[model samples]
Target: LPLPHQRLRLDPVPEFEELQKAGPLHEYDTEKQWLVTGHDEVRAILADHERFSSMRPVDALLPGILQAYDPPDHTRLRRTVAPAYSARRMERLRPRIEEIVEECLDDFESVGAPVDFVRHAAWPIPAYIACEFLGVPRDDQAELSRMIRESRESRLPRQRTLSGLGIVNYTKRLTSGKRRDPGDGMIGVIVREHGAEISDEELAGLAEGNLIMAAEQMAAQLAVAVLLLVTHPDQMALLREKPELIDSATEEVLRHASIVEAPAPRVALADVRMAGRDIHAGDVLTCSMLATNRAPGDRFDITREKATHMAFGHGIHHCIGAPLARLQLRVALPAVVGRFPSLRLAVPEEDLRFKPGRPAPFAVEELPLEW
Candidate 1:
């Protein structure tokens, strides 16, 4: 009886395929949540906020977690910070994104081969970008990288709390220092635009809090994209020959990869019938985006046709950093692949270990690669 989060390797677990066959909804007592795997059912839960609520009040531990809150609350904060990562604005950041990718690759090359891609390239690249976007001091980007990892990997509450607070406190300091003299970057943008509209604490949470999350998520997804492309050499070769296909290829990778195992849990606000099962008030619901996103197929075809997915989630709580993420992947993919001509896994496929034994983004722990 494997759980949705149990699979350790690249492809999704076979049990998930069976769950879909058993119908979309199943009550797994082991995890005490209705694991919804079908595309339509997952979207239904995420879309209908009226029926399903997304409130997990662990504010003391994780303050300002956007997706953890339902509407009105979600709507208000998202509005204040949405413009920074909007598709229009994110595109204007292409040159800077490209430059960051080049710089990361340069550092990667300096370290030489058989290095962990997650350590050398996948993680730092996004940390650098997030700090730059949030106007974090250059000195803090490396600190940001390590702290984000500690929070994600630390199983104990104490370590997690320390790491979480470290980022938030620093984010607060960064925002407050800019109160009268908002220098530059997204923090400045928000301060200059809506300084008086929001409180200092609310301002830090709205602006920099989300950027920390965005960095962590983008790190995992970018690494997974590399793995997906490398394995599908045909796709990788196609991307190499036709970089114009990078945009669609980016979408293809998002569809294929399951970095964020599930979006925030949505609890049933009231009793409702769904997929022939009786969902009760206060019943918890979890959707396996890896499985729902793969409703079409598990094949990693870069040239595949577009199909909607729950990759960045569905409905109003859809990921705000999606555009910025796309921008990073589009540039980083080609830059890494082109730079390392014979880039490949340094170990056997089965020898690889994913981030396991904890609840966090699914990522390769030691993605040792060599050309």
Candidate 2:
């Protein structure tokens, strides 16, 4: 699938491990941007918020708010938004998340023995949880999820533009509903508490971007994790017996199938030297999340060529949802395993399919499975 105009040249053509080895920063001519796949470079640049910024127009094709704005603006917006996802706040949702997970598995259970986890299990679980957390109506989930799935290639200018418009419009509608009805979900809380200071437009953007950032990626992470665990019965047994290994298993899953396969695109605000490359300000740095996580070495004595991880990114912009994401994962993973201790893949691994070349949005669709 050759892209239009070869603009911005988004690399990391999906195999991911290859992109990881291609060093931390490489230019993608098709998308007119640079990508960073190396662990050290990603870590260094992510830390220097003064020298690197996340709020860029890299995803400009979409109508969503950019996650790349610089400090004062970033801080101000984040401060207002932070309360919506505060640790204490997100904790309250744990039981809810657990229930969503159980309900999703129950569907798989009802299907009896063989079902694609992606279809019946993985996909719906996160969407269900996101809907619960955001206070969006259940009736709207399928439509919104369809929109997200269809827009994966938006990194390609036209798709980006169209998806952005669609997402913004769809989100505005959701926001409107929340404003009127007001549930106890995240959206309701924001509208209730922050509505005084935050503009409706800003809230819409926040809602739109957060939806993409949180929901889609979480679905992928869960899909791949179940696939990995089911396929590697030994690891599954270990987890079942010890259960304490849950934490390590989660880290290992992250190490193996990090959701942010490619590093977030960062623009250098200052000239810096790393890995012997002198990067100039205004240059886009693409950090490789997959590469960093798999780099073969230990921290402290970490080797550039083989350092083993950077899945959550580094510095100030590291995933704010890490704790919450892990918490949900901790509950969900074990529960799924425990729920159907007899669950196993009905199809051969060879029957599974893989999707490559998707840009901005990254994920393998539908972990087709049965047990």
Candidate 3:
């Protein structure tokens, strides 16, 4: 079968559907890895870290990327940072996030019709909150946001690297600053509570991942979800007309959007039988949430009832930032709809462009709109 990476495209690919129905696990002809698309099979692999490892099967010290660790080690790091992202914390921050949302809207209130929704609105809310959440010094956000966006939009890998290095280099400095001052927010909380136990490099890696998820992954989600909403006017109108649906609408967006594609691949550590196939110890496996989430249904209806999806992943390495991500959507989407009820795409939908960020790795490059 085709390699799983080919199916990572957010736009539906026939390979995913055929693979899902054909069986739970598929072997790529070129790569020695397996493509896991079955809803249950993917969860089973994710939940069972013992057999399927995320270690990159390493020798050196694992960086703070929880996405690459297994048990005991993964457990320790997650525990240290978990409270900062706990449901209770996210709930309490709703008021702050809401305020940030309104502040963003008000600032861009003067943009003319046909403004690019991504540039004018969709991008800033995530950047503003990420600065606060990661304890980016209050004044640093504007400059940091510019650097981050430029890195993301750079046409060449070299430019992306240099532009992105600005954040990496800056994050190291920010990590050092947090070490001394340790203000409120995840970075400060981590340094304050667990500073001595973890190295600054580790701390910087953790903060960097949060920053990426908070700004790039999140901006991608916002831009794409907004892209979906504006194009689907009936659903957009449904949301505008009935505010209460906001909760389900956010969930529906998460389910349907599947903003992340497969961010990482799992390496098998032992022979395992799953979904009628035998997975060898050395086999590599990847699951596309883009495909797995769609296993339930492909339609993008917001009113659909609660559904199963692995957008945040499963098992120990599931996204720790999910609550914050969800809250951002819950607050941001409705605010946009309410403020611009008549909003519609300014260009032919086909003309829209997208760029990669992560596994979903892609978001509309520009979404021009008119009210």
Candidate 4:
């Protein structure tokens, strides 16, 4: 196990292959315990509910998000929201996600070259898409995005609290508008179906938490995809020839550049062996899905028919916005690359930043692009 120094960094793509070749379970930092990186081992752990539970050290790890919920509780909330993310619903969102992408890309096009695509396209596109889906006023998205970005760097308790308050205030204001003039959107869905059963507190948590998490992850993914595609112009050219390749390329980007850096930490509820390592109660075992997704193996080869990756995660905790994410990438990648055939890095690769203010270790931050 590597000792914790100033920071821990692992290139999941290579490390995943190494762990799969070395053993099923590899010890990470002794303090953080063993992290599962192998494809088969991670699949086994995520699939088996009895052996591996999701619920644990809630406030200890991720607070408020349903990522901490396990089994029945997680199942119920997910099932209720699952329909909202169904193929039909996602299909309906395609045009809107595309519109948002096009509008953002238009701004980049206007900027010409030597601009940070991360700022122009990646960040704003997802913010606007999420706002559109939730039926928030379009005009307020810029302020909301700015506030959310500031919150990412927030360190103090008061700062975090204010961030939460900002979200709550925004949500309350928007939902109040919905009350006066209901629209066919997520907020409307919540009010129509869960109004009688779900509490206002629960709704607030959902709105605030979803916006924070979804917006953050989406921004990261979009930035990573643009950077990777620009870096691999050959792949970008191929994608241009066969735009359908955008779908596979999107999966590849998620596998190769998991914007998320922290391994999902779960407290041991009982004794169990993961990847041959004995796990005791109270110990924290972090399953690094980012590492697992990039595992270099025959099973996870990009050419494989169903290239299995843990980018969105496994089990009931899988990403609810998978289809929406797919749509966003499908629209954004082809459009930008097609628009700027000479698109390349604006800054030296090493000069670019990653995880500017995130607590978790993550991928490159600003994907500055040029022609």
Best lDDT among the predictions, by candidate number? 3
Stretches off by above 4 angstroms in model 2 are 1-38, 55-66, 150-167, 177-183, 296-308, 357-361
Query: Candidate 3: lDDT of 196?
Result: 77
What is candidate 1's lDDT per residue for 162-269, written digit by digit as tens? 998887788888888877678767778777776666677777776555666778888888888998877777777888889888988888888777777787778888
Q: Output the lDDT of residue 133, model 1.
A: 82
What's the lDDT for residue 41 in model 2? Answer: 65
Ranking by lDDT: 3, 1, 4, 2
For model 4, what is the error of residue 345's alpha carbon versus the real structure, in angstroms, after optimal superposition? 0.8
- Candidate 3, superposed: residue stretches over 4 Å from native: 1-10, 29-31, 57-62, 295-297, 356-360
Question: Which of the two, 2 or 4, has more lDDT?
Answer: 4
Q: For each candidate in the order shown, give its overall lDDT on alpha carbons.
A: 0.77, 0.65, 0.79, 0.66
- Runs in model 1 with CA error above 4 Å? 30-32, 57-63, 154-161, 295-297
TM-score for each predicted model, relative to the true structure:
0.92, 0.80, 0.92, 0.85
lDDT of 2 by residue, 1-371 (tens): 32211111112234444544555566553233566655556677778888877756343422224355667676666666666678888889898888888887887778855677877767677767776667777788777765665565344777767766887798788888887876777668877876676677777777887776667777777877777787777777777887887777777776666556554467777787777677787777666564555433322110123324566677656676677677778888899778767667676666666544245334555565655
Question: Per model, how many backbone clashes are there?
Answer: 0, 39, 6, 2
- Name the regions of candidate 4 deviating beyond 4 angstroms: 1-10, 13-21, 30-32, 56-64, 154-161, 175-182, 295-305, 356-361
Poorest 10 consecutive residues of model 3 by lDDT?
Answer: 1-10
lDDT of 1 at 340: 74
TM-score of candidate 4 relative to the true fold: 0.85
